[PDB]
């Protein structure tokens, strides 16, 4: 009789092609996805991500002796029967209904199956509120109710009765209220994922006492106060991850107990108001891989030792907005896998360490707006790979090489004291912004084949002399140009008006002379200032309306046949 | 960041052939490090250049949360649809270029609240309706090239429209 019951489930799902072998072929135990006990009755139904579709069958309740039931990842929809707990079975322990398209609310009869060990109604389309009766399953070992379309509701207090949980994945369920005080009494937790919600209160000082945690994640909440972990209670040596990520109101100094975890791999404590000095204890953990403290009010200095160990895993450092002072750590890239360093908008001073300029694994250096000084080593532009350099608003000095890296694509060295000559080949560059520097010498002859991908160039305030290259017109996708406050002389290129997307041309306060190019008028220009020069002749018709008023002022030899500072021919 | 979300929503509603928006990662905090986006010193989007890049699809109504936008360029593309009514919420807009496209509909009333506009070109489009009178309240407007369309009605002759010559409104038989 079990054959008809088993095939009825397939008939309900309109005979999916996956279960094509379920056609009266003797015993049903050799059928795929079906397992029988010694008596022949079905004990496991594993149909994970097979492809079935349709409503939840009601004939499964006739499969007495069912012990494992997995229907995750399929396209099942509809509504779970209200009498699921009265007929589905009595020997099941692995109910897994997750990732489906189930509608409606969670049935309250699920408390009548007190033998479960795993219940995962997550990533569904449920609605309402988490029932209190769900706390009656004292034998639970993994409960995941996440990413559901719930309403404003607080976790029931009956959840304090679950003292054997191993995974609490309540990620996104519209929660409010205070932080649960019974979490610290579940002395078996391995993953705690109370995630983006509206919870409020202070992090208890007893949650750090469970010596079985492996992942701590509280991303977006309304927690206040400060982490007040006390001495003599730190025992979570197996903790791997801490992600107090964004609460906007956490205060107090960073706890000193975070520098004694021999397995920590990710520390994220940004978007808060932590103060005090970053503890020096975290510079010797031979497991750290990511340290992120984007925005805070931390003072003091970076830890002196960071990555000195040759066998470590430090690859990411990111402190993007703080009040940190001091000097960059010396031995950062000693293991040989360092890939990033972000210390923008800080008050560190000193110079670029020699170790950081020779690490041939770098990917992204983002030091800026600090008070650095000294001279940048010449090896920083040759040995390490580099795709994003943002050294802005410093007092650095140096000299760029003739040829840059083949994959450099962003260079912001504005407001510095760099010297030397302009690089002649930086294939792959798309943003060369460098103003108020000390560059000198004639600009490179071609500058149109070594940088064919340039999109924005700025060289105002330099000391370059010579003439404008004629190959600049060969840069197809260039939008912004600026060579003002220089000593350039010669003639404006006649092909400068033939490029495609030129929209910003600033060539003021120079020593140029000659006639304004006519085809310059036929451009989508939105800004232009060819003033304070030694140009001669007449303004071409079209670039003379009231829009271009303060553009040609200061030219004694210029006249119009509406403008300020321009005489009449 | 709301500006990043708005730009990503614009990306989702636009189809690209040669993948000019490959670097618009939504996970980044600020969108200034993106390509084709220029910011000021305070990490605010103040320029978006997307001219002569093969694109298609339609704009979105989320292009109104960029308060500090100053130059919006989306010309020489294959975009089609209607101009969003929220474009008048950009109080600091200085130059609005949308020419050489396949737009249709009508010039929104909301493009009269902009008191800093200087350029307004809508060449080679398929807009219809009538020219709003609110354009006369923009005293700072200097360049206007509403031509090659299907507009109608009466041409305004008061305010800043007095200085404009007939070349501004050309190839409009129903005007």
């Amino acid at each position: 009789d079990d054959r008809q019951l088993l095939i009825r489930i397939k008939r309900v799902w309109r005979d999916p092609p996956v279960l094509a072998a379920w056609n009266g072929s003797g015993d049903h135990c050799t059928w795929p996805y079906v397992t029988c006990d010694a008596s022949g009755r079905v004990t496991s139904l594993s149909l994970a991500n097979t492809g079935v579709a349709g409503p939840f069958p009601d004939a499964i309740g006739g499969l007495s002796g069912l012990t494992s039931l997995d229907l995750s990842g399929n396209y099942l929809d509809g509504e779970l029967p209200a009498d699921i707990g009265r007929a589905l079975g009595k020997n099941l322990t692995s109910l897994m209904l997750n990732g489906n398209y189930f509608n409606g609310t969670i049935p309250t009869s699920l408390s009548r199956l007190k033998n479960l060990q795993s219940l995962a109604l997550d990533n569904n389309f449920l609605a309402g509120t988490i029932p209190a009766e769900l706390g009656d399953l004292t034998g639970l070992q993994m409960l995941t109710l996440a990413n559901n379309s719930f309403s404003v509701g607080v976790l029931p207090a009956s959840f304090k009765n679950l003292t054997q949980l191993k995974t609490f994945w309540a990620a996104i369920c519209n929660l409010t209220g205070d932080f649960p005080s019974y979490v610290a009494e579940m002395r078996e937790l391995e993953v705690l994922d109370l995630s983006v919600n509206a919870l409020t209160g202070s992090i208890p000082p007893a949650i750090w006492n469970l010596a079985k945690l492996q992942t701590m994640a509280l991303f977006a909440n309304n927690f206040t106060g400060g982490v007040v972990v006390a001495d003599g209670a730190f025992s979570a040596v197996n903790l791997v991850m801490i992600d107090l990520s964004s609460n906007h109101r956490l205060s107090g100094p960073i706890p000193e107990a975070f520098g004694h975890l021999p397995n920590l791999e990710t520390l994220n404590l940004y978007f808060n108001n932590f103060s005090g000095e970053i503890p020096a204890s975290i510079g010797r953990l031979p497991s750290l891989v990511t340290l992120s403290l984007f925005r805070n009010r931390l003072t003091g200095r970076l830890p002196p030792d960071l990555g000195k160990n040759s066998s470590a895993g430090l690859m990411y450092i990111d402190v993007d907005d703080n009040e940190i002072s001091g000097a960059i750590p010396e031995g950062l890239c000693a293991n040989g896998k360092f890939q990033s360093l972000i210390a923008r908008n800080n008050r560190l001073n000193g110079s670029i360490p020699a170790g950081l300029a020779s690490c041939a694994t770098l990917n992204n250096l983002m030091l800026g707006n600090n008070q650095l000084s000294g001279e940048v080593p010449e090896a920083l532009w040759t040995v390490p790979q580099l795709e994003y350099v943002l050294l802005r608003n410093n007092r650095l000095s140096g000299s760029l090489p003739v040829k840059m890296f083949i994959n450099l694509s962003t260079l912001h060295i504005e407001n510095n004291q760099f010297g030397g000559n302009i690089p002649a080949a930086a294939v792959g560059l798309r943003e060369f912004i460098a103003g108020n520097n000390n560059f000198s010498g004639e600009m490179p002859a071609s500058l149109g084949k070594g940088m064919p991908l340039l999109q924005a160039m700025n060289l105002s305030g330099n000391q370059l002399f010579g003439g404008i290259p004629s190959s600049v017109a060969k840069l197809r996708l260039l939008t912004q140009l600026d060579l003002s406050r220089n000593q350039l002389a010669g003639e404006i290129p006649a092909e400068l008006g033939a490029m495609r997307v030129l929209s910003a041309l600033d060539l003021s306060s120079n020593k140029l002379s000659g006639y304004i190019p006519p085809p310059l008028a036929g451009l989508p220009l939105t800004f232009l200032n060819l003033s304070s020069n030694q140009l001669d002749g007449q303004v071409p018709a079209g670039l003379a309306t009231a829009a271009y008023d303060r553009s040609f002022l200061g030219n004694p030899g210029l006249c119009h046949a509406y403008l300020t500072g321009v005489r009449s021919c | 960041n709301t500006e990043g979300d708005a730009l990503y929503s614009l990306r989702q509603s636009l189809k690209d052939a040669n993948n000019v928006l490959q670097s618009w990662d939504p996970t980044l905090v600020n969108p200034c490090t993106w390509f084709h986006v220029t910011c000021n010193t305070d990490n605010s989007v103040i320029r978006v250049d997307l001219g002569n890049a093969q694109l298609s699809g339609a704009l979105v109504s989320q292009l109104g949360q960029l308060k500090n936008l100053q130059y919006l360029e989306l010309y020489s593309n294959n975009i089609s649809g209607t101009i969003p009514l929220e474009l008048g919420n950009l109080t600091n807009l200085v130059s609005l270029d949308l020419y050489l496209n396949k737009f249709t509909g009508g010039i929104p009333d909301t493009l009269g609240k902009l008191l800093k506009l200087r350029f307004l070109r809508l060449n080679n489009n398929s807009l219809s309706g009538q020219i709003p009178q609110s354009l006369t309240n923009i005293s700072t407007l200097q360049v206007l090239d509403l031509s090659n369309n299907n507009l109608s009605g009466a041409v305004p002759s008061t305010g800043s429209f007095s200085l404009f010559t007939p070349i501004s409104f050309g190839n409009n038989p129903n005007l």
């Binding site: 994640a217 991303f219 977006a220 994220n268 972000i342 | -």
Partner: peptide, 27 residues
Amino acid sequence: PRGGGSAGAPNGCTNNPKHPPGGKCHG
């Protein structure tokens, strides 16, 4: 399946243009 995410997956908000995959920017 329907979507990603599992257990204690990390957050996504970073300034790094080249970061390991995984996460969604919350905050």
